[PDB]
């Protein structure tokens, strides 16, 4: 997906993000805005 | 009901005067009608449907407290309503033949 | 950036009587209407307006007079001692002792 | 109640928008969707005010430690979201239209 | 004697009123350069006289003006000019009452 | 030059048009009419005749509209409003 | 300084001058010399009304000006010389279907 | 007393003219209130906009122009209805603009409810 | 009761409105809380409604307000403060 | 701390607290911190807000909700309400 060029642009409000980075267990919830269209392998590249 | 006393003046046109009087009483007939929590969206609603419906064509409206216009409007149609915290205005647009 | 023009007059003649005459005016006539510049000239087909109602706003301040504050230092160790004696040093007190 | 009420509510109402339309259609529908779609004109210009007072309810709720779900929670912040894909859908099926 | 003075005074609406037509966008451009003018030529007069000026602005479509003033003043000292212009596109009209202070 | 702009029927780029020639009428002017004449010009002289702008601190509307030319929103404690009609 | 008693105020003067003009300019038609007798009357009937009101050590001047108007611009302005503690002024034009009128009613003082 | 030299000054300034009004400067890095760099002392009385034109301007012209062209654009769309092979032709419609060509926009700016309140200052 | 009024910018024959209702308002009220209350209430009552007082012995204000909408003057060692905010 | 009026967010009272002590350490002129106060606190969020500082007086102000506070520091007292 694009985005992955984009994240200056969830940097520029990362809210929901750093909510998911405040949270425990981190793979057991996914951040909702539209991110959620993302595979286990490109899940576990961002929470490498 | 009996209306209680409005502070009410019409300043800014270039229609005929007869045509801004009656463009106040139906503005305050509308406000009459309209419920105790008055809004300014439904205040701009009903006067733009009563205007359509008593004047050929389309007309607009904008109604508020702090703002600010800049419109092309059509030649002897433009109002500007004080009624207590109510500035209003209403304007024309040109209507194709039918 | 304002006209300051000043004149200067004496305290007494501020008491003179108001000058007040009876006057009437005059008037020119000039410049007839013509129909013929109104024929040339036409009315505004669909017109600019520019509206605002945004109230004029301004700023402003209120003071209230203050009582100042000021500083000074005291202090006593040699006691009470006649105005004209400094008890600093030792010659000037020998010598009033030998006037005491 | 009023959260499930309106989300549900737009569901229904987005799903039974998204028939499609295949080459030649018949003469049926084309009631039907002046009046859909004027409605979801009629409701947008009033949504954002329906919207206040919905996040100040969970602020309230959140404010003193109640349990909620954390699911609850993830829809309300989607439903944000969610109006926005309305919209582009609203303004294609115009111009088809 | 006042025919100097509208000597200079017709030389200065004719200065700044002889290169333009009417533009409601930039006639206050006018009005503020022609008061400044007037009023520097006061400043530089240091006579005893108090002045009341009136300089107005008209758009030429034809329409007719009439320059009816009145006087309350003693005429020995006191005085009055009056100064029109005109063209194809507009016209202006200033009037001036001085009077010998008391 | 955050703004959060919920209400379009008109294109993208006009969109962006129209944000960075609200950013640059407030660069340039003072005054809310000021800005309200640049930006109804900007537009008419641009796109052509007939084009319409509200500005407000607090106000309501009711106008009818002509298709894929309009935008409004909200820029802080004040809102844009910019329509073709003619 | 002068006295406040009898100090020069237009908040009176100007309803009185606008009700007058609003009751005897409202119909009025178009003919030169009418315009000419009916301004010199204007003149008269407000320094009546002024002078009735009784100002004293002020002098008053009216000053009137009458055009024909079709819809078309026209610019207004005035300046005298004189001090902001004492001298007023003020401002007063109307406008019908035939015409328009403009009268300044300036005050000064008398030292 | 009576010998007492007194000096007086005459002025061109409005005292109409004695606040000085300001404006919020929305700039990125001032967010200020700003006065007006000047405020003229020439007073302004009276004004009317005008609304004269004389038929020689090319603007006006322009939009006469226009004008005839939208009224040509009318009746050629008027009987492109009544005639649909004329659409065919080449005849434009939707200069004719029907409920379908036109549509209505209506909006509201939110505001919160003023309240009142009062604060007492006890003393020390 | 005498009093000392020279900050204003706004029309006398309202400013001798207000010192007059402050006036009645000192006399009838000895707590400067009922006083700033009474002004209020009679001066909204009278003219148009967003206006605001402050009563004081020592103390710091200024504000932005509307134009020719402001009055502040003494009543011996009090100060009484009356501005437009709306 | 002495704080009994409010119509604020927590954040509000806070960052308040520190504007109000930040001015009185600078200044001891009225103008002054009420200025800093006023100026510094629309910069960061908006027109119109104003502020009061006095330290005995009266005043009966008008404002949306959570847009008021009322304020102490030893012998300085501060209003802070929106209007406009």
């Known amino acids: 997906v694009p985005p992955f060029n984009l994240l200056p642009g969830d940097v520029t409000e990362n809210n929901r993000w750093r909510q998911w980075a405040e949270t425990e267990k981190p793979e057991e919830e996914k951040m909702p805005s539209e991110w959620k269209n993302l595979t286990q392998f490109q899940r576990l590249l961002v929470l490498r | 009901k009996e209306r209680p006393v409005r502070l009410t003046s019409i300043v800014r046109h270039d229609c005929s005067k007869s045509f801004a009087n009656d463009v106040l009483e139906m503005a305050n007939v509308v406000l009459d009608n309209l419920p105790a929590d008055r809004m300014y969206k439904d205040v701009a609603t009903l006067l733009k449907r009563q205007l359509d419906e008593t004047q050929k064509g389309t007309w607009h409206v904008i109604a508020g407290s702090h703002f600010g216009a800049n419109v092309t409007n059509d030649a002897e149609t433009m109002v500007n309503l004080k009624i207590d915290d109510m500035y209003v205005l209403v304007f024309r647009s040109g209507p194709p033949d039918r | ?100 | 109640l009023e959260l499930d009420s309106l989300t549900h509510k737009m569901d229904e109402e987005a799903h039974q928008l998204s028939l499609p339309i295949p080459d030649q259609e018949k003469l049926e529908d084309l009631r039907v969707l002046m009046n859909t779609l004027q409605d979801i004109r009629d409701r947008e210009s009033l949504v954002e005010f329906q919207f206040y007072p919905v996040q100040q309810a969970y602020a309230l709720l959140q404010r003193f430690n109640v349990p909620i779900f954390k699911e609850e929670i993830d829809r309300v912040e989607d439903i944000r979201f969610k109006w926005r894909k309305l919209h582009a859908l609203a303004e294609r099926r115009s111009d088809e239209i | 004697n006042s025919d100097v003075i509208q000597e200079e005074v017709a030389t200065l609406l004719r200065m700044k009123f002889g290169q333009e037509v009417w533009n409601p966008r930039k006639v206050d451009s006018w009005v503020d350069d022609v008061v400044d003018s007037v009023l520097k030529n006061l400043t530089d007069l240091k006579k005893p006289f108090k002045f009341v000026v009136s300089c107005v602005i008209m758009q030429r479509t034809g329409a007719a003006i009439s320059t009816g003033f009145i006087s309350l003043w003693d005429n020995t000292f006191d005085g009055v000019v009056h100064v029109p212009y005109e063209n194809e596109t507009l016209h202006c009209f200033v009037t001036v009452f001085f009077v010998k202070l008391d | 030059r955050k703004a959060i702009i919920k209400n379009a029927d008109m294109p993208e780029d006009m969109q962006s048009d129209a944000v960075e020639v609200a950013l640059q009428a407030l660069e340039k002017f003072n005054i809310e009419k000021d800005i309200a004449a640049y930006i109804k010009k900007e537009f008419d002289k641009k796109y052509q005749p007939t084009w319409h702008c509200i500005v407000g601190r607090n106000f309501g509307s009711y106008v009818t509209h002509e298709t894929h030319s309009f935008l409004y929103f909200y820029f802080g404690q004040v809102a844009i409003l910019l329509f073709k009609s003619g | 300084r002068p006295d406040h008693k009898r100090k020069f105020r237009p908040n009176d003067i100007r309803p009185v001058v606008r009700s007058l003009l609003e009751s005897r300019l409202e119909n009025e038609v178009y003919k030169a010399d009418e315009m000419q007798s009916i301004s010199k009357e204007i003149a008269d009937g407000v320094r009546d009304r002024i002078r009735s009101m009784e100002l004293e050590r002020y002098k008053i001047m009216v000053h009137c000006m009458i055009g024909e108007q079709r819809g078309q611009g026209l610019r207004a302005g005035c300046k005298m010389f004189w001090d902001s503690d004492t001298d007023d002024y003020f401002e007063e034009v109307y406008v019908t279907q035939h015409l328009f009128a403009v009268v300044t009613v300036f005050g000064l003082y008398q030292y | 007393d009576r010998d007492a030299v007194i000096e007086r000054i005459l002025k061109a300034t409005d005292p109409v003219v004695m606040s000085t009004p300001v404006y919020f400067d929305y700039r990125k890095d001032a967010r200020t209130y700003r006065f007006f760099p000047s405020v003229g002392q020439t007073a302004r009385h009276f004004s009317v906009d005008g609304g004269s034109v004389l038929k020689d301007d090319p603007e006006a012209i322009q939009q006469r122009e226009d004008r005839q062209r939208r009224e040509h654009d009318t009746e050629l769309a008027a009987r492109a209805e009544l005639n649909p092979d004329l659409v065919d032709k080449g005849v434009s419609t939707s200069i004719l603009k029907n409920q379908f060509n036109y549509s209505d926009r209506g909006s509201q700016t939110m505001n919160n409810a003023m309240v009142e309140r009062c604060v007492l200052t006890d003393p020390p």
């Open chain 3, 1 to 100: 950036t304002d006209v300051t023009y000043s004149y200067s007059r004496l305290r007494k003649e501020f008491g003179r009587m108001p000058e007040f005459q009876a006057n009437e005016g005059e008037i020119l006539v000039d410049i007839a209407p013509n129909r013929s510049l109104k024929n040339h000239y036409t009315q505004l087909d669909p017109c600019e307006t520019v509206i605002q109602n945004v109230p004029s706003l301004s700023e402003s301040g209120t003071n209230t007079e203050r009582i100042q504050l000021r500083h000074h230092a005291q202090s006593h160790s040699e006691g009470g001692w006649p105005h004209g004696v400094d008890p600093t040093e030792f010659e000037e007190k020998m010598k009033y002792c030998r006037k005491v």
